[PDB]
Amino acid sequence: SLEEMLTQAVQEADIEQVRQLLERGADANFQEEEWGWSPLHSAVQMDSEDLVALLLKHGADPCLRKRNGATPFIIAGITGNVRLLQLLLPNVEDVNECDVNGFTAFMEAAVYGRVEALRFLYENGADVNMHRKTKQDQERIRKGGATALMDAAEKGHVGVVTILLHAMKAEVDARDNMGRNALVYALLNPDDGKAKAITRLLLDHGADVNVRGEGSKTPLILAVERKNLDLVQMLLEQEQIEVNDTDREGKTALLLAVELRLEEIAKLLCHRGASTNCGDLVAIARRNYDSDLVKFLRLHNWKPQSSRWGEALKHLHRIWRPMIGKLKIFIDEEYKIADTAEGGIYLGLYEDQEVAVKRFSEGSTRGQQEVSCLQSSRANDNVVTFYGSESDGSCLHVCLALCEYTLQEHLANHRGDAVPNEEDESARNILSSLFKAIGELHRSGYSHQDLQPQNILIDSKNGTFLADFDKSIKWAEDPQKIKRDLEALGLLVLYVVKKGDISFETLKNQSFEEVIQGSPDEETRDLIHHLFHPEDRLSSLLAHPFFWSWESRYRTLRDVGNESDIKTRNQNSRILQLLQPGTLSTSFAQWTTKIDSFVMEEMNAYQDTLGDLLKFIRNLGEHINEQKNKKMKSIIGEPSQYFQEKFPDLVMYVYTKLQNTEYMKHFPKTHN
Amino acid sequence: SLEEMLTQAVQEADIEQVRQLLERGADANFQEEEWGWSPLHSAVQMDSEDLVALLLKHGADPCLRKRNGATPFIIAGITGNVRLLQLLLPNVEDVNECDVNGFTAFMEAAVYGRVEALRFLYENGADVNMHRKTKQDQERIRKGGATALMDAAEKGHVGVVTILLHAMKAEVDARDNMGRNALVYALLNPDDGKAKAITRLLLDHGADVNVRGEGSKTPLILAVERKNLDLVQMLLEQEQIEVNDTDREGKTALLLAVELRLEEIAKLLCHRGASTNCGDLVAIARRNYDSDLVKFLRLHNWKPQSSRWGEALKHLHRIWRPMIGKLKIFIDEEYKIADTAEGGIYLGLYEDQEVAVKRFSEGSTRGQQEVSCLQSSRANDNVVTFYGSESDGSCLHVCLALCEYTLQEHLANHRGDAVPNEEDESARNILSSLFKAIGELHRSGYSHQDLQPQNILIDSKNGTFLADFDKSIKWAEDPQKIKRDLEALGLLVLYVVKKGDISFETLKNQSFEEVIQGSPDEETRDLIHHLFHPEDRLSSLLAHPFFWSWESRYRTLRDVGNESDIKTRNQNSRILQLLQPGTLSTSFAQWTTKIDSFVMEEMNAYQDTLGDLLKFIRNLGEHINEQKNKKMKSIIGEPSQYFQEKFPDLVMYVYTKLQNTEYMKHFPKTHN
């Protein structure tokens, strides 16, 4: 805290405390860590000559460089104080020294409009036409190479431009690495009057009128887009100008002129030799309601991916619209996807991609929670994909991936697909996606407060996606509220499982008790139970046998019945000691009798213990397909289904018993 | 082609042919399908009175509405021809009729600056202070409700504003649905001189100076941002103005003034009672190099998710930078990720999210192929996630998801993890991702011409992502070139499999023959073979046993050896007729001898046929764990590994034989 005390002394311009701290022996070259600023730099910045000398007195280095490589002599070009430049110059070996980005003291004087300091540097040996030498990464992308003239052209210092061109023998048509010259930079200046001067100055000195900036915009084009008649005239007076040149989109200056309702500028361009085959101009002017320009001008493949929305998208790509940023959109019933509590969901095109657009008041608080969440959710594969947002003056457009059907529609549409008791694989695929969806959302610290089946969407590929966050929150604030998603998830597990025959509204007016009851099976009940009463909760439920395929459950039960300790009926064994330490209201107490009479006997050639039942199943499963057992096979049907239908608590029981044991291995390989 | 012939007749102003086509009896009310335009509308638009009468003569409906609900009388307000309004008025029941968006003929006259037509409508019974009544969706997001004054204020028609305020008893402080009044709209007009007039006019008539537009900007703020001293003065003269109010980000007008280097505007605000505790203005002005303003002003927890890049991100969030659009970025070695052929890969913050930024020349052709591909790849979960792009003048910033390690680094970092012969599950997880990555890329019509291991990235979660598309192409053009990705994929399969001990450069200078040879197993060879010689190719290779786990392969071989036809050795069977129609250079010819002497004998209590071998394995696998077989178990080890190591061509052979048969069922459940 010696040079730290010196830093604030210099910031407050407190000169006697600087001298005391300097005579106390505090470092006059001390550079602060972040940006490498020294007391001398600080001084020159703040325009204080008493401090500047007092530092050079006590041994300050005027060649010292802060993080961007600039010296106090370079800084002196910014502030524009000539005595401060004079004062320093004896210790400056090279006057054309420069920072990392190639800014010399003279350039900085040109940038910042400092004429006396500009004149001074010229007289002392400054290179006027020096191009900025900048970093490797910066040059390989063609940045850098700007000259002092270009700076004064961009910033609009006319005094300096005049002085450069005439007195200081400055090259007018000199170019930076992108190919731009001062004329280009000059048309970028927002101030009309200053821009109009510098253009004339540059054109009179012979600056090249056919050049290109960003876009491949020509000066002529920049001027059209700026909507300035005077700058257009001034450029069109050069008779060597190429009026029929086109910017990167293939657009000629005429085209734009008509597009932007610029009558006088368009007419003027036509006279000066522009062509009418640069695009339909007649239609555009009509469109615009340019009565006179229409008069004047007369006298002179895309494939959508969506099936449900393909036709309308084609027509939206076809028709002419103005962009809102990167969003082409039209509000009209033909392109409406759904009502909302605010602005509806419409079809839209985004960076040429099909997108459903959720429209809000820009000022809406719900709309703000939405874009906030979706911004944090880009990596989440099971959240509807997020393209971006665009404001016009008044609406906030939220662009999302465009799916085919809400869940509720999907389940209705595919309600006829399955035969009566058929295993429901896709319920598992729908639900397992949302678990991961909500899992990752919770991890991002966001909770989705309105889980319901219209918020869930199913794409063309049958992928399922969690999708609306206007009422979401950072659960960080009130961790109690994470529960509400897990509850809703529970209703959703039954909703899906029951194929959509029960409404979600019915499910919302039942109690936990009623729902659990309404569930068709024990897996489904235990899953919903755990969702009502619990983080990695959701990931740790994907291992749940609810998500095990029927062949996996049958595979598991067999692999257990193949433990030798089960086969020999070693009642002292560890595995058995898990499954059945002596007293059952289960469905597999007295199991030998609820089996068919035929099959049981054949197999006997077997007690009511659970161990024997798993023994039984293993056997049945190995041998069932042998030719000798034709009747067995015919009676049982599909064995996995036989045993589940027969003993609906079996699998859960077994799962529960071996849950965290070494016999987990026999569970089916699962998500992690 | 009768009213179609009439439409072009009217467009070309060809009056006699219009009369002939009208006397021929062609529909004078015909509305073209797309936008609902009629000959009468067309006429009024184009400002032609001979045609307008001639149409009303032959029975044209002047109350007819095109798609946006506008009538020819509404259109007449746009064109601003008073005789044309007079001519039509007898048939116009309501003069304040309006289109779907609530634009009346008078509003359109105010919008388009048509005074004579404005005066005429007033005198005929137009409502001056009518608010636009617009659609349900539009009103729930608070658009609409704009008045004729607001339109003329926005568009900068000063004549009309004067006329409205004085002669036509227009309400000055009237508000649209967002809460905006004409003063707000007037500060939006880019023309300084026209804006300055309308503000004075509005303020003199008592327009409310404390109001809010977008942002939640006050007039005062809009003016600061416009950088207009004169509009600031004009507003600050109202002594009831709230200078200390803040826009939606919490920013006061002073703050912005200092932020934008506005000395005179800031000083003026301070005098007019603004506060200095609106944020660190001293530091900002220093930063800016506002020497005098610094003088004037002296008188008077964010958490990154990345582990490798956390520290630097923190410091990038901490420091002050100007936004490039939605990208906060600083070029400095501390925040550099990698060199490139152009602008490097730097750290960046995007909508407050951490992103790696791939920097190009805006004009670069490679850079254009990149953003083009990534825009089409948002739905692809194995492509590095795409945030968006931002141009400054000269660099094209491509913002991507920020991962921890390139593949090449990852494999080096985890090279110590596995014990010598350990099953490599993560090679399968790395490769299976890229298959799906390149699969979906090919399906989007894009091909990635430079597949190599630095183009592959591994996130914090160990997810793997395909990522460099600067050299990608639409393969549509030259479908021969899709083959080059699959080739590279082949080198990659070996690169990954060999844990990264062989370089990719070595792999690039081998022949197909050499690579296949360098492969450690038969699965790996057949996968690479197929990748050298083949757009669902890639999806149909995910079923490949190369991606089967060792337990799956053992599970499969057993499930086959459990076919009864194998057990009875029914040589006439279908399954056996697949596996072994008679004469083998395989490793399972004479298999009974390459097995251990002990184990073979025990099991015997078995020919050299492939059927018997699968019989053998099934048996071994069921019974191996029984207590009696302790030595068997000790000798064999893990049975899946035993049999693979012993017979390295076995699984491929079996796969090949039953590949498209009904015995596919015994293959392990796979990706689809």
TrEMBL record, chains A, B:
Positions annotated to bind Mg(2+) 2: N455, D468
Q: Return the ANK repeat spans.
A: 35-67, 68-100, 101-133, 144-177, 178-214, 249-281
* Keywords of the record: ANK repeat, ATP-binding, Metal-binding, Nucleotide-binding, Repeat
Q: Which GO terms describe its biological process?
A: mRNA processing
Q: Name one GO molecular function term.
A: RNA nuclease activity
Q: Indicate whether Cell cycle appears among the record's keywords.
A: no
Which residues are listed for Mg(2+) 1 binding in this entry? D450, D468, D470
Q: Name one Pfam family in it.
A: Pkinase
Question: Which residue range or ranges hold the KEN domain?
Answer: 550-672
Q: Which InterPro entries match?
A: Ankyrin_rpt, Ankyrin_rpt-contain_sf, KEN_dom, KEN_sf, Kinase-like_dom_sf, Prot_kinase_dom, RNase-L_RNase
Fetch the CDD domains from UniProt. RNase_RNase-L
Q: Where do the Protein kinase domain residues begin and end?
A: 331-547
Q: What is this protein called?
A: Ribonuclease L
The organism named in the record is Sus scrofa
